[PDB]
Design a protein around this nucleic acid. Structure first.
Lengths: 217, 348, 121, 107, 121, 55
RNA sequence: AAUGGGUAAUUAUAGCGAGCUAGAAAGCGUUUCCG
RNA sequence: ACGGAAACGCUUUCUAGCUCGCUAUAAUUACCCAU
């Protein structure tokens, strides 16, 4: 049969993440690395390409034997979910990562917040002669919350190996809380937290009970 | 898995300042009680335009008196019977050592998140780790600082390898030392110290008009440090011996040639969170002394010795934890060395 | 007044209008005006440039009203910055900020001043 | 009136090589988020059907429900999709059929 | 000035006219100019080449006025870009930008500069 | 007048072929969507017409 | 000495700038009127 | 009493698949100035 499973989750931040864009017409002496933002609302967002990239390259150090020279070489428990372009049976893989926008923009008000993206000055310092080279980079602020909206896609080939899939996705997020969700994360910046995970079926009458107790173990 | 973590418990001694770039200028704070209030000066101007004192305030700012305490912002509010604050609420309690009481000028802000709480950024702590690591290893503290073009003061940034470098597998030692930020601690631990330059070949300590708002000593701040590879993973439980060796080579010169009452003992692993400290904790010190003693033919000349010692005045405070109540300075009149801190590090 | 087709040439002609060191024959035609004092003035407006592509204009009348105070305070002390505030008509141009576009045009006028000051000297 | 400059945002992306960790950037035009497109989906009713009309309305409504759960166009596993369909209503632009029951059927 | 039949040849001759490293012959005839300095300037000429095809020339000109600001500032600090705006004259090609076709001709001139800077590497 | 370079657009297009799911592109040329064409249609009246002209 | 003040730098630096698949595929090339 | 008359260049076809805006980087240095 055919089904669609919706992994809804919240993304809290512990440190503020910096998923970069580039603004070419940024000012002199202003934000030199701005974040990706929504053009209408001007809130920062977490693009799904960055989630699908970090989760794939962190699961590739776990679920691949004979480490991948290219993302065309993932060991087909990983290529099922993420897709190999150079493979006839797994291109257009199972997962659909939606962009997490923001949820708590009202909740950041009444905590006292001028702007939803803070600016951090960051100072290259030369370790000969102590001369400096400052930065100003945007950073989506600390207690933000984003609507993670993964969607898994069940066909007849899926049916006997869904749980082997869901033991990966649940272990993707746990791998990603132990790492940084994009940015300049070697110095803080994007230690992240996936909270209140919830897989609900949205098309096709699939039992989501024996896999929803596995997401909170 | 291979991600092995560390807790760095950072005992702040000897007040610590970080960041924020900007500064509250003079005439932007009131000293009403025994505490400094720092308004949101746009809202200050809003309420003071509502009371129709805009031209009076613009004539107050450009007008200087022979006394200082009637130029600050409390003298505007008392020469106009202004009684309420209700402004952007932020105030820090004075120590009694900023000094004529409250005639300080141009305090430097401490770095703060969007919620308005101070915190130490892990970017700023992975520079103090990185000077220790770049000073204790003999391979990085070699004849570094390729000049090769124009001005001398550049560094061979490519000596510690960090780029991706196609073909070659990606090592990048300091990608694999992830230092996270602090929890945002309280504004009550901020004390507003001022700079003091203790010279060599001159016994005086001169007060400078710097007013870094700084973390009070004996505050404990927790950092997490995740290491991923084995090579960078081994340099972090060895930060104890490398911090002690960095201090041993740093007490060898520039913490010689000074009286020992200025410097204080540490008793945990010594680190220098950065402000004030200056040019020897920020720098790898030999090529530093050459090319950095070169860089000043100005009025504010870095003089003939290695440097001028950077101290502050801050309230005296004892730990009482070891076998003895440790007085925490070896002098009277409360001179601390700016930016000194201690830490203990622990896996997981 | 400065429109979008003149605020850069006005800034160039204002930095050329600026007072120079008649003394100090070693490196003559240097200004009595350092990079630090002018980049203080640029740092006044950098945050209003950044938080105006995001915010509505009516949430910014507070700090734009305080710029009136802050530029005349910076022109109070160090009387050769006062010369730049008079020459490059900044207090005249602050009164004309009435929308987002005029605000950002003034912020880019300040960046034009800093650009032609680094270029000239 | 929402104050946006363009109607296409530009999405700056990159790829990290698995070995050697080199980044290769990308710039992708995409439409901006709260943009809206007039969708019209002309359906022909010939004399032959007589049951297939209400049978096919179910299929069209289900195929519009599956575009909201899947993506559209895009690079959909990486964002780029998530179309919503609002104000679903049908009306006979060439007459003599009753779309009362179908506009009730489109909730 | 840029005609539509010479500007790529002007850009090639100007990239060859950039003076090179006579210092150490670890791959000599490199430039003082680095790729990132020149590529930050193409980064903002090539996002007006995109918008010019969509928007109108009377709707872009705050950006087009800021191009002169950023080229003057980047050729302030780090004189190897001042070398490029002298050899490949930009500030004179920027004053003559009154038409949208002239705007796009300047944007593709800047792209020809970066193409031959990469080619002669 | 309203700026249009060519009177035809070229629409790129493909044929994702159910699994293998390999695409198969296509370029088809269209006219553009404010083109207006001068349409004529001559109807004729005769002796047989005159009862059936209105119909 | 006291008093009043801060001042000078650096404002990002070095890179990557897209890569590989697909590049059209099935059908219909005349039928009827006519001898 | 037009080598004519009748005859849609039409049907089917997702510009799609894979791809972290990443890498390194203490907002720091210097210590004075004027009467």
């Amino acid at each position: 049969t055919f089904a669609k499973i919706k992994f809804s989750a919240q993304i809290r931040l512990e440190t503020g993440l910096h998923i970069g864009g580039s603004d070419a017409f940024a000012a002199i002496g202003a934000i030199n690395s701005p974040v990706i933002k929504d053009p209408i609302t001007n809130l920062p967002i977490i693009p799904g390409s960055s989630l699908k990239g970090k989760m794939r390259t962190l699961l590739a150090k776990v679920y691949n034997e004979k480490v991948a020279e290219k993302p065309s070489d993932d060991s087909d428990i990983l290529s099922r979910l993420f897709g190999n372009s150079k493979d006839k049976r797994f291109k257009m893989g199972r997962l659909i990562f939606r962009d997490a926008f923001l949820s708590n923009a009202d909740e950041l008000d009444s905590l006292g917040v001028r702007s939803y993206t803070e600016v951090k000055f960051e100072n290259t310092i030369d370790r000969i002669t102590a001369e400096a080279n400052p930065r100003q980079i945007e950073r989506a602020i600390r207690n933000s919350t984003f609507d993670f909206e993964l969607i898994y896609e069940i066909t007849d080939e899926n049916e006997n190996q869904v749980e082997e899939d869901f033991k990966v996705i649940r272990d993707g997020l746990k791998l990603l809380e132990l790492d940084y969700l994009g940015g300049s994360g070697s110095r803080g910046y994007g230690k992240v937290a996936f909270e209140n995970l919830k897989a609900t079926t949205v098309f096709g009458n699939y039992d989501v009970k024996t896999l929803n107790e596995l997401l909170t173990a | 898995n291979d991600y092995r973590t560390f807790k760095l418990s950072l005992l702040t001694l000897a007040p610590i300042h970080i960041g924020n770039g900007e500064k509250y200028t003079s005439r932007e704070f009131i000293y009403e009680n025994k505490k400094f209030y720092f308004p949101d000066m746009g809202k200050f101007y809003n309420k003071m335009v509502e009371k129709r004192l805009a031209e009076k305030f613009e004539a107050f700012l450009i007008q200087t008196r022979p006394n200082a305490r009637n130029n600050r912002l409390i003298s505007f509010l008392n020469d106009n019977r202004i009684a309420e604050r209700s402004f952007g609420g932020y105030s820090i309690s004075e120590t009694g050592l900023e000094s004529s009481a409250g005639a300080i000028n141009e305090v430097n802000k401490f770095i703060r998140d969007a919620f308005g709480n101070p915190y130490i950024p892990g970017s700023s702590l992975k520079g103090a780790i990185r000077t220790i690591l770049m000073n204790t290893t003999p391979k990085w503290n070699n004849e570094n600082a390729v000049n090769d073009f124009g001005r001398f003061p550049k560094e061979n940034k490519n000596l510690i390898p960090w780029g991706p470098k196609k073909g070659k597998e990606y090592d990048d030692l300091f990608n694999a030392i992830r230092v996270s930020d602090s929890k945002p601690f309280d504004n009550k631990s901020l004390i507003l110290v001022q700079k003091w330059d203790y010279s060599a070949k001159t016994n005086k300590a001169k007060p400078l008009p710097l007013y870094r708002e700084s973390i009070s000593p004996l505050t404990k701040i927790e950092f997490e440090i995740t290491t991923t590879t084995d090579e960078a993973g081994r340099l972090i439980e060895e930060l104890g011996k490398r911090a002690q060796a960095f201090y041993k080579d740093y007490k060898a010169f520039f913490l010689s040639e000074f009286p020992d009452d200025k410097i204080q003992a540490n008793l945990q692993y010594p680190i220098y969170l950065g402000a004030g400290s200056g040019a020897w904790t920020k720098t790898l010190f030999k090529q530093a002394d050459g090319i950095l003693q070169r860089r000043y033919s100005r009025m504010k000349t870095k003089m003939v010795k290695k440097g001028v010692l950077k101290l502050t005045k801050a309230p005296l405070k004892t730990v009482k934890i070891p076998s003895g109540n440790h007085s925490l300075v070896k002098n009277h009149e409360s001179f601390y060395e700016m930016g000194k801190a201690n830490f203990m590090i622990k896996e997981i | 007044i400065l429109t979008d087709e003149n605020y850069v040439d006005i800034a160039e002609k204002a930095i050329l209008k600026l007072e120079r060191n008649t003394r100090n024959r070693k490196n003559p035609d240097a200004f009595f005006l350092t990079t630090s004092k002018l980049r203080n003035l640029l740092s006044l407006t950098s945050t209003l440039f950044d938080e105006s592509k995001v915010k509505e204009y009516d949430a910014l009348l507070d700090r734009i009203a305080y710029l009136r105070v802050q530029f005349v305070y910076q022109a109070g002390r160090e009387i050769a910055v006062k010369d730049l505030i008079e020459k490059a008509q900044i207090l005249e141009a602050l009164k004309e900020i009435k929308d987002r576009e005029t605000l950002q045009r003034f912020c880019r006028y300040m960046e034009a001043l800093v650009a032609y000051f680094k270029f000239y000297g």
